[PDB]
Design a protein around this ligand. Structure first.
Ligand SMILES: O=C(O)c1ccccc1Nc1cccc(Cl)c1-c1ccccc1
Length: 136
C-alpha cells in the first residue's frame, strides 16, 4: 500500500499546552479525584496506520489507553476516566473527527495538524478544551 493523507498524524507526540481541560472534564462528568490526577498528566500520544486500521495510544502517569479503528466504523471504547462509550471516527477535510456517545450524552474530539503541532479540540455542550502536542 502507498501513502495516505492521514499519515500526517503518524508518530510520537507529547503534550505541550492545555487550555480549559478541567472545565471540559467537568462537563463530561468526570469526578473530582480523577479530574485532579488526570489534569496533572502530560500524555504521550502515539499514532500509527496499518492498512485501513488507525491506532491511537495515550501513555501517561494517569493511564495507558489504546484504540484501534477503521474510519466510519463504530467501535467500543473505554475512556481514561472509565466511561464505556460508543465511538465513530471519520476524516473531514484533513481533520480526524471522533464522536463518543454514552448515557444519552455526546462529546466530539477533533485532531488536526497545524504547523509542526497536533492540535486536539475536545467539545462538550458549549465547553471546549484545546490540547496541543508536539513531536517527541
Ligand atoms: O489527554 C488528551 O489530550 C486527550 C486527547 C484526545 C482524547 C482524550 C484525551 N484525554 C482525556 C479525555 C477525557 C477524559 C480524560 Cl481523563 C482524558 C485524559 C486525561 C489525562 C490523561 C489521559 C486521558
Amino acid at each position: 500500500r502507498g501513502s495516505h493523507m492521514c499519515d500526517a498524524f503518524v508518530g510520537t507526540w507529547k503534550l505541550v499546552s492545555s487550555e480549559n481541560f478541567d472545565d471540559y472534564m467537568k462537563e463530561v462528568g468526570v469526578g473530582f479525584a480523577t479530574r485532579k490526577v488526570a489534569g496533572m498528566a502530560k500524555p504521550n500520544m502515539i499514532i500509527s496506520v496499518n492498512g485501513d486500521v488507525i491506532t491511537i495510544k495515550s501513555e501517561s502517569t494517569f493511564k495507558n489507553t489504546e484504540i484501534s479503528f477503521i474510519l466510519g466504523q463504530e467501535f467500543d471504547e473505554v475512556t481514561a476516566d472509565d466511561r464505556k462509550v460508543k465511538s465513530t471516527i471519520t476524516l473531514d477535510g484533513g481533520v480526524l473527527v471522533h464522536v463518543q456517545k454514552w448515557d444519552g450524552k455526546s462529546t466530539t474530539i477533533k485532531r488536526k495538524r497545524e504547523d509542526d503541532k497536533l492540535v486536539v479540540e475536545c467539545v462538550m455542550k458549549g465547553v471546549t478544551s484545546t490540547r496541543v502536542y508536539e513531536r517527541a
